[PDB]
Amino acid sequence: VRDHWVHVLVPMGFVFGYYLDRKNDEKLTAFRNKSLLYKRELKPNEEVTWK
Amino acid sequence: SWDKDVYPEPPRRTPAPSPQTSLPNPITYLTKAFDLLVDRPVTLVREFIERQHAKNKYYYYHREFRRVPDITECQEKDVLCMFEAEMQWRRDYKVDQEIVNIIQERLKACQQREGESHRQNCAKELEQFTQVVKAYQDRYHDLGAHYSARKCLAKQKQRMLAERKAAKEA
Amino acid sequence: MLKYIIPTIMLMPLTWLSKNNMIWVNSTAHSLLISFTSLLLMNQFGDNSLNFSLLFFSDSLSTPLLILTMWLLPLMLMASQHHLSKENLTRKKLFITMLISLQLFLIMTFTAMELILFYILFEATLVPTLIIITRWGNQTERLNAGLYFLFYTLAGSLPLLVALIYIQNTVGSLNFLMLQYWVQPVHNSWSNVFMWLACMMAFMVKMPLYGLHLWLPKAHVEAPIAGSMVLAAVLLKLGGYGMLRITLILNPMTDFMAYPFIMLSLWGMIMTSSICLRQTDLKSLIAYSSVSHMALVIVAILIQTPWSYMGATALMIAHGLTSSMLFCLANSNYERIHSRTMILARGLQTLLPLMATWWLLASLTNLALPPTINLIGELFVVMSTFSWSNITIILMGVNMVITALYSLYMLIMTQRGKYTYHINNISPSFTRENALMSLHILPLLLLTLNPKIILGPLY
Amino acid sequence: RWQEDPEPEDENLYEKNPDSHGYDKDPAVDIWNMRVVFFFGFSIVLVLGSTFVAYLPDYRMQEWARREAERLVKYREAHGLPIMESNCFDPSKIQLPE
Amino acid sequence: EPYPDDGTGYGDYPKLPDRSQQERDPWYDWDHPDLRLNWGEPMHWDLDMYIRNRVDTSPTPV
Amino acid sequence: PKYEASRLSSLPTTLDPAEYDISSETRKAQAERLAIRSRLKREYQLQYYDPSRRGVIEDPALVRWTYARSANIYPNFRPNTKTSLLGALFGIGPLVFWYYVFKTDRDRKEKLIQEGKLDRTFNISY
Amino acid sequence: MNMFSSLSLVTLLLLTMPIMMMSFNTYKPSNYPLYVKTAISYAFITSMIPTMMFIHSGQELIISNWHWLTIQTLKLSLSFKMDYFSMMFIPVALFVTWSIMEFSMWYMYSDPNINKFFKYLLLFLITMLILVTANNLFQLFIGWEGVGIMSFLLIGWWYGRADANTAALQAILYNRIGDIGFILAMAWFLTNLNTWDLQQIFMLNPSDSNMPLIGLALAATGKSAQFGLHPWLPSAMEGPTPVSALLHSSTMVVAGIFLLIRFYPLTENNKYIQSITLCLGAITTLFTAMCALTQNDIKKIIAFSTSSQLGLMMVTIGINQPYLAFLHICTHAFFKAMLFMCSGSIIHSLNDEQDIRKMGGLFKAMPFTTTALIVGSLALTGMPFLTGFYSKDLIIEAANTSYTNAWALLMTLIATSFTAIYSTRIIFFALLGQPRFPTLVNINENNPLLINSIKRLLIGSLFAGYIISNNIPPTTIPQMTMPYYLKTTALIVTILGFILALEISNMTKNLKYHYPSNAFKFSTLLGYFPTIMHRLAPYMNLSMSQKSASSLLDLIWLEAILPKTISLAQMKASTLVTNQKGLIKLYFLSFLITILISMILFNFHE
Numbered sequence A: 001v002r003d004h005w006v007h008v009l010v011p012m013g014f015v016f017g018y019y020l021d022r023k024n025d026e027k028l029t030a031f032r033n034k035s036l037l038y039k040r041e042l043k044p045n046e047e048v049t050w051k
Numbered sequence B: 001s002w003d004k005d006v007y008p009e010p011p012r013r014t015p016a017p018s019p020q021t022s023l024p025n026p027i028t029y030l031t032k033a034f035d036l037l038v039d040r041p042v043t044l045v046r047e048f049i050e051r052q053h054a055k056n057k058y059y060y061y062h063r064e065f066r067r068v069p070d071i072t073e074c075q076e077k078d079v080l081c082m083f084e085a086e087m088q089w090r091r092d093y094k095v096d097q098e099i100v101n102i103i104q105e106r107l108k109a110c111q112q113r114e115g116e117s118h119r120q121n122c123a124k125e126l127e128q129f130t131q132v133v134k135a136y137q138d139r140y141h142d143l144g145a146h147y148s149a150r151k152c153l154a155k156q157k158q159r160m161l162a163e164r165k166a167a168k169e170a
Numbered sequence C: 001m002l003k004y005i006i007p008t009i010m011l012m013p014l015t016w017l018s019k020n021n022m023i024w025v026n027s028t029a030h031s032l033l034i035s036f037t038s039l040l041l042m043n044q045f046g047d048n049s050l051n052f053s054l055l056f057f058s059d060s061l062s063t064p065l066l067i068l069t070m071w072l073l074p075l076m077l078m079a080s081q082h083h084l085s086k087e088n089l090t091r092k093k094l095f096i097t098m099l100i101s102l103q104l105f106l107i108m109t110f111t112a113m114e115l116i117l118f119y120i121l122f123e124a125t126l127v128p129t130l131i132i133i134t135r136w137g138n139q140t141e142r143l144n145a146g147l148y149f150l151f152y153t154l155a156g157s158l159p160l161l162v163a164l165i166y167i168q169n170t171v172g173s174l175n176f177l178m179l180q181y182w183v184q185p186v187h188n189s190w191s192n193v194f195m196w197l198a199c200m201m202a203f204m205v206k207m208p209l210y211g212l213h214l215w216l217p218k219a220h221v222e223a224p225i226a227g228s229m230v231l232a233a234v235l236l237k238l239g240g241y242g243m244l245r246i247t248l249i250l251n252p253m254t255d256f257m258a259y260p261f262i263m264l265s266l267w268g269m270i271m272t273s274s275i276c277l278r279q280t281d282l283k284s285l286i287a288y289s290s291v292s293h294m295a296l297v298i299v300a301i302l303i304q305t306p307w308s309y310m311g312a313t314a315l316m317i318a319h320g321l322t323s324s325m326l327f328c329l330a331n332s333n334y335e336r337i338h339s340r341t342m343i344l345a346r347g348l349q350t351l352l353p354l355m356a357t358w359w360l361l362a363s364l365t366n367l368a369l370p371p372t373i374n375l376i377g378e379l380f381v382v383m384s385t386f387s388w389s390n391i392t393i394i395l396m397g398v399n400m401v402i403t404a405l406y407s408l409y410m411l412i413m414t415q416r417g418k419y420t421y422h423i424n425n426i427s428p429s430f431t432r433e434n435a436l437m438s439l440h441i442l443p444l445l446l447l448t449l450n451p452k453i454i455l456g457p458l459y
Numbered sequence D: 001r002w003q004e005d006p007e008p009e010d011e012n013l014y015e016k017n018p019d020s021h022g023y024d025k026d027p028a029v030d031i032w033n034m035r036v037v038f039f040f041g042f043s044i045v046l047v048l049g050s051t052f053v054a055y056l057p058d059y060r061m062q063e064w065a066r067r068e069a070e071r072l073v074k075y076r077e078a079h080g081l082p083i084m085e086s087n088c089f090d091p092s093k094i095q096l097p098e
Numbered sequence E: 001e002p003y004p005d006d007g008t009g010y011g012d013y014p015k016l017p018d019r020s021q022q023e024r025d026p027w028y029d030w031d032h033p034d035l036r037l038n039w040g041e042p043m044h045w046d047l048d049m050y051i052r053n054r055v056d057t058s059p060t061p062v
Numbered sequence F: 001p002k003y004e005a006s007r008l009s010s011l012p013t014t015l016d017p018a019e020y021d022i023s024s025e026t027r028k029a030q031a032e033r034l035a036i037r038s039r040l041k042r043e044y045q046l047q048y049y050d051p052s053r054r055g056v057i058e059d060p061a062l063v064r065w066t067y068a069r070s071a072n073i074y075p076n077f078r079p080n081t082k083t084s085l086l087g088a089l090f091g092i093g094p095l096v097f098w099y100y101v102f103k104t105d106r107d108r109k110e111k112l113i114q115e116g117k118l119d120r121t122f123n124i125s126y
Numbered sequence G: 001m002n003m004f005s006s007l008s009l010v011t012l013l014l015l016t017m018p019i020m021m022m023s024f025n026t027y028k029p030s031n032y033p034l035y036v037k038t039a040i041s042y043a044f045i046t047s048m049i050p051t052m053m054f055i056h057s058g059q060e061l062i063i064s065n066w067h068w069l070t071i072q073t074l075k076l077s078l079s080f081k082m083d084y085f086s087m088m089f090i091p092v093a094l095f096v097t098w099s100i101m102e103f104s105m106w107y108m109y110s111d112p113n114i115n116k117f118f119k120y121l122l123l124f125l126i127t128m129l130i131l132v133t134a135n136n137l138f139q140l141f142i143g144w145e146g147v148g149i150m151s152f153l154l155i156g157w158w159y160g161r162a163d164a165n166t167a168a169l170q171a172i173l174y175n176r177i178g179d180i181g182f183i184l185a186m187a188w189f190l191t192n193l194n195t196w197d198l199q200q201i202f203m204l205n206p207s208d209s210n211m212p213l214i215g216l217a218l219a220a221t222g223k224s225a226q227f228g229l230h231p232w233l234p235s236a237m238e239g240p241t242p243v244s245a246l247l248h249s250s251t252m253v254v255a256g257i258f259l260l261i262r263f264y265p266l267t268e269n270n271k272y273i274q275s276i277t278l279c280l281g282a283i284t285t286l287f288t289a290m291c292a293l294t295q296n297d298i299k300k301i302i303a304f305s306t307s308s309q310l311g312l313m314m315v316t317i318g319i320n321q322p323y324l325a326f327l328h329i330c331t332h333a334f335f336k337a338m339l340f341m342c343s344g345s346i347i348h349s350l351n352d353e354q355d356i357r358k359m360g361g362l363f364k365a366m367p368f369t370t371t372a373l374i375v376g377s378l379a380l381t382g383m384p385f386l387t388g389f390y391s392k393d394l395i396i397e398a399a400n401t402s403y404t405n406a407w408a409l410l411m412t413l414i415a416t417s418f419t420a421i422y423s424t425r426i427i428f429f430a431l432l433g434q435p436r437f438p439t440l441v442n443i444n445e446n447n448p449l450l451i452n453s454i455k456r457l458l459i460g461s462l463f464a465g466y467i468i469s470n471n472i473p474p475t476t477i478p479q480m481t482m483p484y485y486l487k488t489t490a491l492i493v494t495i496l497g498f499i500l501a502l503e504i505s506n507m508t509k510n511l512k513y514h515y516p517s518n519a520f521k522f523s524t525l526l527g528y529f530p531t532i533m534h535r536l537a538p539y540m541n542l543s544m545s546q547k548s549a550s551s552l553l554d555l556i557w558l559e560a561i562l563p564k565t566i567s568l569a570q571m572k573a574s575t576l577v578t579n580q581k582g583l584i585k586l587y588f589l590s591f592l593i594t595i596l597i598s599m600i601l602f603n604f605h606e
């Protein structure tokens, strides 16, 4: 609607911001399942421990 | 509901009623009224709620932290090892705060329970409180707001050096 | 933090692309939504901070300051939209843009992992703040207040820049997580004395420390209401937050370097509290009250104990809401009588009964009635300074007496007594004004039920 | 002196709109402004936000620490060990100077 | 009569009697009855210290 | 027993010897005081009673008072032997006084702790 | 236990319900005062059940129901101490407040904000109960400051009156000065014992308790208006009469004494603290009784009566008889509240006249208020077997036979004689002789709210002391062997006080005109303490604020030493640089000087 299309700007900014925060995590996986505290074996269907 | 060894309680000794009067005890009748008017309806509501809970049983767990090398085994400036050693130290520090709280809780319950005989009957709790507070003070006191495993280790070594020095001259 | 930076940025296209008559409605609604999402930063752990990326992290210190910052933006829009009604549309949007850009800098400032990044954003907040005061302030003296504000900050912050760059050369990093592990003790020397002063003076000027506080009463008397709210609520806390971080790398030199600044604060708070008893301008009185409350925070930060750091954090949050309330209360009188003179309009409880309740509640938090978080913060500081030296309780106790006297004096003078006969335009409190007051006090009093979330990392 | 406009008279919003909420001169905008503030401010942020805070999952691990302390106090007292030792770190891992 | 010209900073502001407002006539029709002030009359430099809630300088029977 | 006035207890007006010895020159002055008061009263009442007025009757006396109590001080300030000695006495002096009070207290406390003569048996909160 | 703990909490929750109903949920504004009064009366019933259980078997318990906050090793929980002192005080406070609230429904009938008035009375009572049942110092501090702030709002009830606002702030000022002691004790107990809980404080039982106890003594001084921080209590008569009745009996003023009673396990081992409280109480009881001798305002005489009776409680603390001090709190609540209620009855009938010199001839005109006033005066003066006798007389015997400061003992006995004199003064001038009030007679005490409320306190003023003394369990070894002249000293000095008071009163009828003495002026003007202290100290502080702190420092020298002087230097420097004549000759001449200097002086050519 031409009346209420401005109301998606900030909610879409949050979704885009949320998405980019998750993308940031994919660049910081050098130690995923490699810390002495949390390192373990993968479950049969598990590919990664977190994403 | 809780572990009786962690939060101990002596066996309760209640005297039996031994009236020496013909008057009725108003507390006895209020107790009956309270049991009939308050407790029984409350119990019925709870038992309904507990039946619903029994239909949806599910569980939660106490997180287990594997031990990792402590700050003594970390090479200088090796942040990756320091980080894991530091986080472990912080978790232990929080646990030691709650151990002191458990002992303080034991001490406070003994004081109230023993009434006017508390100065004599609470010696064991007082002694345990004194020892844990001393142990806690040695570990953590004086480290400052920016405390760390490094500063804790430095304090311990200062204490160790003082203990060795005195032992030599003896 | 991108989930907060981007929607904050999107507030600017929203304001500029809104219908002419819907700029306040739209900007207020969506900045409240941003404030709602900021509660996700409460995912805090007992050992580790919330480390988002290479640029931004959040911990128990920055999280409460972040939530206060994002909550204040909709409150500032509510407070400003009335005195800006005559302003033309484009300049209204420019005003809102300055508020939005201030929030963007603030949320980045409080989450910046690297100290030089923190510096740039810490400095960037000056620009919009100065524009708000000088462009939209009401009186001739806003120009002087702008200059004093600008040059007091830069006189201290430029030496901080040199010190920060020097630290990075010596240590190799300014990442705050790195400094936690590579920190080395600061040895005695004249070079280290001036490194300490360069690292601290900029934050002292912002707090402000007694003796470097004269810019703040000026700034408040000249700023528009929104300027006063953000100045008192958040911008002062940039100094406290900065000090809480940088003191990590100044040990053990802080042991003796803090003495002159503890004396200035301990004696400063009694002087500024006493000064409040004689102030004739209501905004100036609230401004001097801030200097006294923040003198406690400086002492707490400088003595570096777990109790003092917890008290400092709670005080910063509690004062932020209380002082912002008091300015909003004083402004609502100004919008009727157009004077800041405290003695001009008296006996307002007779004419504005509900507004007098907000006045009472604000005053009670200002004097730290238990169990408000204002009292929790003050008490934790008093407990920790007693161990530092038992004699401080006398100074702390005297300030508590004087604080009650001037807080209730302000309440008595303006709300009680006889109303001024010739002031016949005291129109009933608007829904907007009542909602603005309650949006301060209600979160403030609700925090008493779960104080741990405003107690900081040392909790 | 110069050619300058006179100071306008301050306008009481209640004259034109006795129902004014004090947000806007336009009654329709005024009512909407009141509604977003009251709904997003009180109904959402303060009510749901307060509820959200009330149910934060063990904020900063305080509850886990108490459970962990109980486990250690139980095990240590059963085995006749000190509840807590003065040494945070094992002395055998430390090499003192001199 | 101005305050003595030292460095204090009074300027030309009048020095008025160091008397509390409580000493003013309570039956006269003051423009400000609570303060016992008339519109336009010069205010004592320390008027805020001499309001009826604060410092009294009234004659005492002893 | 004569009345002795003090700063905080004024001489009663009925015991003031100047109250009774009233000359034609003193009555002339009292008349001029009442003329200023009456002129200001009329100026006020003309606005106070005006049915069309809504707002605040600005009082220049109040504005002059608030202006004098702030902005007018520094322009009329002169650094001289009085303000410098009062400036030093109550500006630097208290800071030096408190510095020595707290510094002495903390040195004494720290010396006892290091020697182990300060009782900190249950002190684990700080 | 389940009934005991459940019912003790329901009492406190019951009192909060009328406050919660102010959210307009299910409210009946028509008669909010009746609703509040009914809640108090029902709370009194529920509180008698656990009180009865304690009397039977000594059942005591602590309820730590809600964990509020843990600060490392300091865990703060909402904890309630349902012990001896809270079990006996709560029913007394509720019973007295029940009469005061019923009385206020008549006294405040024409007040447009009566609903708000009853809300403030209820909030007053709630903060006191928080104070009395608190098991840790932070919770106690909540009630401590709560009653102070409620005192401020109720003393300044008629806020258009400058004197009311002054009195209200004065109570805050003096109580905050006492609060310095309270925070001192909190800081000491945390630093040295790692706790704010009474259990841990008593278990660790420090021997070096001078500092924490002096802090508590200072807190009690302010709250109970002991000498030094005393003037605020007589000034609190600015408030409506129901405020004074509640303030002076069941709430604000006894809090200071109660604080010291709660810490008797520490004070009983500290003879230095005992000496201080003994002498502080003795000068208070003597000095304020002396002031009452010449007061003419009826509310002020009774106000000074409270200060004198509070000083006696502080003496009882001094001689290490905490349970006797507590008993006096409970007995004093009945007849002191009645005395204010009777005075309010007189004031109302005489169209707000409070000067006893304008009363007189009321013995038959107001028969019921007369009966209550006489009974209350006899209970206050220790007439045998009335409520006041079961505490005061035991206190006097305990003091007489104790190892104690001889001067403090004498001051206390004289103050007991002065109690008889100033009670005689009220009866003589208010009730006897001929009327001295105006001609249009509007005397009328026939309202059932007035009669019934005073009636219940009259019954308490006769039997409450006997009933309480016969049910509480012994916790001391009462001293019952003494010479005849130490056993009857209280009765004799009281009787001599009555006789001497009658000589003075009757001499005012002789057609002889007398000049005033210095002693009379000293008594009337309250020892000049308010006149000197309330002018001098505010003047000195307020003068320092504007002259030195604000103007001298913040508007002058802190300006001068930096921003003002720095700007001058740059402006002067700029005029040096820019004031050039624009002459080619002068500029190139400076080039030559620069090149020469660069070589000869600085050797830049090397």
Ligand SMILES: CCCCCCCCCCCCO[C@@H]1O[C@H](CO)[C@@H](O[C@H]2O[C@H](CO)[C@@H](O)[C@H](O)[C@H]2O)[C@H](O)[C@H]1O
Pocket (backbone or CB within 6 Å): A003, A007, A011, C025, C026, C029, D032, D036
């Ligand atoms: C998750 C995102 C949440 C964002 C929340 C944003 C809240 C925004 C509130 C907007 C207020 C409504 O805004 C307004 O609504 C009405 C009805 O829809 C619109 O339409 C109106 O036009 C005219 C009025 O002139 C009339 O036909 C009628 O009053 C109405 O239909 C307006 O053109 C619009 O300006």
Ligand SMILES: CCCCCCCCCCCCO[C@@H]1O[C@H](CO)[C@@H](O[C@H]2O[C@H](CO)[C@@H](O)[C@H](O)[C@H]2O)[C@H](O)[C@H]1O
Pocket (backbone or CB within 6 Å): C016, C017, C018, C019, C020
């Ligand atoms: C390839 C690079 C270029 C990329 C360009 C991408 C965006 C292009 C947008 C083109 C349309 C812009 O639209 C043009 O500007 C604004 C917003 O619409 C409109 O005018 C505006 O006036 C006011 C605000 O000032 C509001 O009522 C409303 O926002 C709108 O009506 C103009 O009437 C329209 O002509």
Ligand SMILES: CCCCCCCCCCCCO[C@@H]1O[C@H](CO)[C@@H](O[C@H]2O[C@H](CO)[C@@H](O)[C@H](O)[C@H]2O)[C@H](O)[C@H]1O
Pocket (backbone or CB within 6 Å): C144, C147, C148, C151, C152, C153, C155, C156, F074, F075, G562, G563, G564, G566, G567
């Ligand atoms: C210690 C760290 C911080 C130090 C900061 C100090 C830097 C200087 C800050 C203020 C800069 C303002 O720059 C200039 O200052 C002077 C006064 O100082 C102002 O001038 C003002 O005070 C002067 C002196 O009383 C008056 O003559 C003048 O009428 C008045 O306007 C100028 O209008 C302003 O342009």
Ligand SMILES: CCCCCCCCCCCCO[C@@H]1O[C@H](CO)[C@@H](O[C@H]2O[C@H](CO)[C@@H](O)[C@H](O)[C@H]2O)[C@H](O)[C@H]1O
Pocket (backbone or CB within 6 Å): C151, C155, G564, G566, G567, G568, G570, G571
């Ligand atoms: C810690 C280091 C901080 C370094 C900061 C450097 C800030 C430099 C600020 C600009 C300095 C010049 O600023 C200029 O100063 C002079 C003197 O005060 C002011 O001059 C003003 O005050 C003087 C002093 O009474 C008056 O005589 C004059 O009539 C008035 O105009 C100018 O109005 C101001 O524009």
